[PDB]
Design a protein around this ligand. Structure first.
Ligand SMILES: CC(=O)N[C@@H]1[C@@H](O[C@H](C)C(=O)O)[C@H](O)[C@@H](CO)O[C@H]1O
Ligand SMILES: *[C@@H]1O[C@H](CO)[C@@H](O)[C@H](O)[C@H]1NC(C)=O
Length: 246
């Protein structure tokens, strides 16, 4: 398992947590020196448990699919909660079976569906370490509308930060004051599958993307990523979604 404590958290302890989370995800191969996540894992091993503690020391445990870093569900005291999607229902066959009761959330886990439930796009939701403390607190007691916004925070400050060092750094700059994510952050989130795929296609194609990926850069301008020499690939992306799952 991996763990993170908000009580006393700072850029350094958060960086250690994100390091721990990346490290918990199995791979047999690196592509362009990036860990390539597995095509599949069978059974309960496919799920990582993340124990998160709010400032008061209250906790939830979040179940993450190790093949794609997707949040499937979470446990808060004796109640488990899972997204309304088949991969989550499958996960509920393996994790938090000890819970007194299980709630299926009234949305799936994808951004569009969560934003609808939440009533705002994530462009308008501040993220940061304080926002994460709030999200854990919220998820402690069932409220599906508030839970959708908390889950948008939780997904970006955990999974998206594991995927991209730029996102991890953005959260680090937000250790003590929340801020809506940069449009570059939004762009990388939305491009993860495409980038992972193109980085994979680049082997067998001289480091060259078969199809270019358009990102917004951390200076606000729109740009094209065409090969493995881009800073996005050499320094930023930390994990590859395997093309079998794409
Ligand atoms: C159309 C849709 O909802 N896609 C994915 C789901 O499926 C992926 C791509 C798959 O092919 O396994 C995934 O389970 C959820 C995670 O909660 O996020 C969505 O972005
Ligand atoms: C490779 O990517 C670099 C970085 O943007 C770019 O300057 C160069 O034009 C690209 N080369 C090819 C062949 O795509």
């Amino acid at each position: 398992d991996v763990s993170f404590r908000l009580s006393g958290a700072d850029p350094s302890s958060y960086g250690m947590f994100i390091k721990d989370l990346r490290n918990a995800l199995p791979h047999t191969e690196k592509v362009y020196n990036i860990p390539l996540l597995l095509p599949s894992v069978s059974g309960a091993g496919r799920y990582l448990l993340m124990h998160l503690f709010n400032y008061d020391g209250n906790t939830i445990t979040v179940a993450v699919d190790v093949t794609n870093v997707y949040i499937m569900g979470y446990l808060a005291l004796t109640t488990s909660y899972f997204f309304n999607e088949p991969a989550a229902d499958l996960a509920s066959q393996y994790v938090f079976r000890s819970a007194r009761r299980k709630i299926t959330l009234p949305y799936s886990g994808n951004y569009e569906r969560l934003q609808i439930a939440a009533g705002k796009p994530r462009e308008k939701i501040p993220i940061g370490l304080p926002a994460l403390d709030t999200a854990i607190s919220t998820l402690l007691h069932y409220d599906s509308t508030a839970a959708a916004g908390a889950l948008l925070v939780l997904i970006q400050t955990t999974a998206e930060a594991a995927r991209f060092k730029y996102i991890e750094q953005q959260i680090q700059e937000r250790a003590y004051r929340d801020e809506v994510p940069s449009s570059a952050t939004i762009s990388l989130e939305n491009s993860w599958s495409g980038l992972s795929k193109q980085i994979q296609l680049a082997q067998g194609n001289n480091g060259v993307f078969r199809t270019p990926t358009v990102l917004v850069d951390s200076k606000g301008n729109r740009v094209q990523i065409t090969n493995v020499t881009s800073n996005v690939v050499t320094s930023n992306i930390q994990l590859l979604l395997n093309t079998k799952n794409i």
